[PDB]
Structure 1
Amino acid sequence: MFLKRLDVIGFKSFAERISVDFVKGVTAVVGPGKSNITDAIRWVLGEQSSRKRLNLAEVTLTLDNDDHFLPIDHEVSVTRRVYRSGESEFLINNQPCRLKDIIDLFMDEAFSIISQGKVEEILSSKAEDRRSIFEEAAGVLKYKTRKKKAENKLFETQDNLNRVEDILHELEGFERVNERYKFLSEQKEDLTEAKNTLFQVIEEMDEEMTKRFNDTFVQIRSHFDQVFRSLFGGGRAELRLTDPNDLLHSGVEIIAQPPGKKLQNLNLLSGGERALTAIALLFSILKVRPVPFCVLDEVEAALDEANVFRFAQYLKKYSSDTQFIVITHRKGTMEEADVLYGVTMVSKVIS
């Protein structure tokens, strides 16, 4: 749930312990080497993101240890180490543990970790793969998995029929034969009936899957336009669909007209407009499948002021929802912030 604290020793730029105490809701980070705090959590969490200190006005280091205070519904410590050679350990409340063990209360998605590159990760990607982001928010991916295996399972039961059709023709001609053939084709006829109606089921389920998809896709459209204005003030914003049908494998375009320039294509928009639109997009996807962890890594650096304001505004208002830790050099957020920790390059931090 709401993160209590982060303990930091020997990690990247971090010489001494610098412990960070992490309020519920909004929190802040200032610098021109500060960037590395997201990476900490990012890394302790296990998502993708030298890795140990070595700073030359100080002796190089062979371990890195980072700790997540992080209270759940108890206070639960999640802590991660690495060495040369080196081993790596995992400790819940400082007792050593496995990694599958990390998820647990995580799945019984989770957090979002947002940097400037991820915001390009999206905008750039060929509009085919993008729908994955909506499939994910439409919660429709699990169906897609099991459906997929039920099919691979279905071809099995299929091939056995063909193998059965083979004896049936060989059986065209004592007491053995007639009693069997009468039954064999009796039973196989029953079997292809089962098979048929399963695909039937996949249809309906594919109807719900898509019903599921765009029911959600429509909601994400509403908020995309509504949030776009709350930031640009305003313009229109829509998310198109290449191949409106063939939905399951169809694509999603993102078109935005910031105030001034007419409704047109992203990028050739340029600016920190093409930035803002995505921040707008993200607040809105966050509306359909929210998560109680959000970090933002120097994301508003292309926005101009009142922009930076309205964005920072949005987080000011996004408080009681999820815990927000944003890291930036920006002024709009800094005073609109709640709690700041300064980080200055070896690096050091406190209020």
Structure 2
Amino acid sequence: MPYIEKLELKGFKSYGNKKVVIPFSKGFTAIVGANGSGKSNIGDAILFVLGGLSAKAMRASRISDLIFAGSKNEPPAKYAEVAIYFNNEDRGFPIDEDEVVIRRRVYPDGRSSYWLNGRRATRSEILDILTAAMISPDGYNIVLQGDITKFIKMSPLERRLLIDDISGIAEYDSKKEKALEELKQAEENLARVDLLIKEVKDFEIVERRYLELKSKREKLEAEKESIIEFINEIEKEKKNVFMRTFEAISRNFSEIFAKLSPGGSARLILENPEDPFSGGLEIEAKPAGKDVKRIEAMSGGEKALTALAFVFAIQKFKPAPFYLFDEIDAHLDDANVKRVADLIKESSKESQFIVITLRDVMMANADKIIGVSMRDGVSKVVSLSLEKAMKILEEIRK
């Protein structure tokens, strides 16, 4: 799967007029620093370059407030710019390049421009390429500030649509639409032949025409019947693929939640198991020694562990190219943060993980750590490899 090699920021929020390059581990990167350092702006930068339209979602009041406003030693920027570099050696992107670069600029007048590997592109073209690579602009794998609350307040219908997507049943809806088109034409042709037969009811002429119409009708009726069977089959297969997906993720979710919350347990619930597509997807969890609660009623740490168990339940079934977390630890003590970080580190063999944090227990598990600090109203970064650090210090222990 593709992964993020680096992110380049220029004139974006607290990042000044000199381009700042943020490199990433293929596995687990932690983005760390003081609150107020600009470390969280890196999350907003990724939402931005992947096409985010909502200033609030990028922690700004208007889109133009994403533009660096100047500092002690710097003038304001003419525009905000972010470029993201994906490794594409396995062609997760339908582009014949070992590297896919997406670049976005926004200007004080509020307009945005996009580039795909140096060539201009519309936002729609960018989203199409990200969809083809199964990279979401703001999907379930991106959990920034406020997104755990959003997942808690999410409707059961929206929650099921997430599983619909992961399961891949959209190909079945497509096949069904094409079969309904064929059925439509069959019915139109049947009604046409039926009108022509009614009118028909010189002997040789009328008998010839009646026999040819009766034969065309017989072919149309068989064609109609086989399309209806095909539609029935498609509907069964769609339900089957979805249920296989749901049951595996449901199992994952229960296991993971029991691991994050020792002595606890939880279940995914289909509001209509008989016809899943007529209802939502609900969540109930029972923390150790507490009553069964339903996810919308959950608070604090239980709420965050539940949302995280759901994310990892999906990533264990179908891993996304990357996951981007910020504020997921705000209501977790060190013991709980340890369990999440171990889960992240174990999953980071199959997906890229970027975690913005100042919790050292989360930090400890990372392959690389990007430290962010604000110098004179301008954010700057320092990069550290933990493997390299471990080796260098073990050798100094002599």
Distance apart, 1:96 and its partner CA: 3.8
Q: Does 1:299 align with 2:314?
A: no
Does the 8 Å CA contact 1:29/1:343 hold for their aligned counterparts?
no
Q: In the superposition, relative to structure 1, how do residues 305 and 39 fare at CA in structure 2: closer, same or farther (>3 Å)?
A: same
Report the TM-score, using the length of structure 1 for normalisation. Answer: 0.90
Of stretches 17-26 and 80-89 in structure 1, the one that deviates more from structure 2 is 80-89
C-alpha separation in 2, matches of 1:341 and 1:66: 19
C-alpha separation in 1, matches of 2:157 and 2:129: 32
Task: Name the amino acid aligned to 2:374.
Answer: T
C-alpha separation in 2, matches of 1:87 and 1:125: 31
Distance apart, 1:108 and its partner CA: 6.2
C-alpha separation in 2, matches of 1:280 and 1:300: 13
Of stretches 245-254 and 209-218 in structure 1, the one that deviates more from structure 2 is 245-254
Task: Name the amino acid aligned to 1:293.
Answer: F
**Identity %, equivalent residues:** 34
Segments of structure 1 that go 5 or more residues without pairing to the other structure are none
C-alpha separation in 1, matches of 2:111 and 2:151: 35
Match for residue 350 of structure 1? 381
| Per-residue Cα deviation, 1:185-212 (whole angstroms, up to 9, x for no partner) | 2212221221122121111121111111
Match for residue 8 of structure 2? 7
Q: Does 1:90 align with 2:105?
A: no
How many equivalent residue pairs? 351
C-alpha separation in 1, matches of 2:48 and 2:133: 21
Structure 1 counterpart SS, 2:195: helix
2:104 to 80, 97, 100: 80
1:152-167 correspondence runs (5 A): 152-167=181-196
Structure 1 counterpart SS, 2:4: coil
Match for residue 54 of structure 1? 69
| Per-residue Cα deviation, 1:90-114 (whole angstroms, up to 9, x for no partner) | 3344344455654558626335322
Q: In the superposition, relative to structure 1, how do residues 54 and 309 fare at CA in structure 2: closer, same or farther (>3 Å)?
A: same
C-alpha separation in 2, matches of 1:173 and 1:144: 50
Q: Does 1:18 align with 2:48?
A: no
Q: Does 1:71 align with 2:73?
A: no
C-alpha separation in 2, matches of 1:28 and 1:289: 23
Q: In the superposition, relative to structure 1, how do residues 97 and 209 fare at CA in structure 2: closer, same or farther (>3 Å)?
A: same
Does the 8 Å CA contact 2:179/2:227 hold for their aligned counterparts?
no
Of stretches 304-313 and 90-99 in structure 1, the one that deviates more from structure 2 is 90-99
Match for residue 275 of structure 1? 304
Of stretches 223-232 and 268-277 in structure 1, the one that deviates more from structure 2 is 268-277
Match for residue 256 of structure 1? 285
Does the 8 Å CA contact 2:142/2:323 hold for their aligned counterparts?
yes
Structure 2 counterpart SS, 1:208: helix
Match for residue 38 of structure 1? 43
C-alpha separation in 1, matches of 2:207 and 2:378: 87
Does the 8 Å CA contact 2:71/2:378 hold for their aligned counterparts?
no
Q: In the superposition, relative to structure 1, how do residues 269 and 80 fare at CA in structure 2: closer, same or farther (>3 Å)?
A: closer
Match for residue 257 of structure 2? 228
Structure 1 counterpart SS, 2:103: strand
Distance apart, 1:52 and its partner CA: 1.8
Report the TM-score, using the length of structure 2 for normalisation. Answer: 0.80
| Per-residue Cα deviation, 1:115-148 (whole angstroms, up to 9, x for no partner) | 2433333322221332111111211122113313
| Per-residue Cα deviation, 1:233-272 (whole angstroms, up to 9, x for no partner) | 1311111121221222232111111111133323433222
Match for residue 340 of structure 2? 311
1:137 to 159, 162, 166: 166
If each structure's strand is expressed as a fraction of its own residues, which one has the higher value?
Answer: 2
C-alpha separation in 1, matches of 2:202 and 2:167: 56
| Per-residue Cα deviation, 1:152-181 (whole angstroms, up to 9, x for no partner) | 452243233223322322222964432122
Structure 2 counterpart SS, 1:321: coil
C-alpha separation in 2, matches of 1:3 and 1:247: 35
Task: Name the amino acid aligned to 1:110.
Answer: I
C-alpha separation in 2, matches of 1:27 and 1:297: 12
Does the 8 Å CA contact 1:228/1:234 hold for their aligned counterparts?
no
1:107-256 correspondence runs (5 A): 107=132, 109-110=134-135, 112-172=141-201, 175-256=204-285
Distance apart, 1:149 and its partner CA: 4.1
C-alpha separation in 1, matches of 2:158 and 2:112: 34
Of stretches 78-87 and 289-298 in structure 1, the one that deviates more from structure 2 is 78-87
C-alpha separation in 1, matches of 2:369 and 2:214: 76
Does the 8 Å CA contact 1:34/1:344 hold for their aligned counterparts?
no
Q: In the superposition, relative to structure 1, how do residues 265 and 206 fare at CA in structure 2: closer, same or farther (>3 Å)?
A: same
Structure 2 counterpart SS, 1:164: helix
Task: Name the amino acid aligned to 1:181.
Answer: Y
Task: Name the amino acid aligned to 2:82.
Answer: D
Determine which structure has greater relative contact order: mean sequence separation of CA pairs < 8 Å that are 6+ residues apart, divided by chain length. Answer: 1
How large is the RMSD of aligned CA atoms in angstroms? Answer: 2.6
Of stretches 312-321 and 116-125 in structure 1, the one that deviates more from structure 2 is 116-125
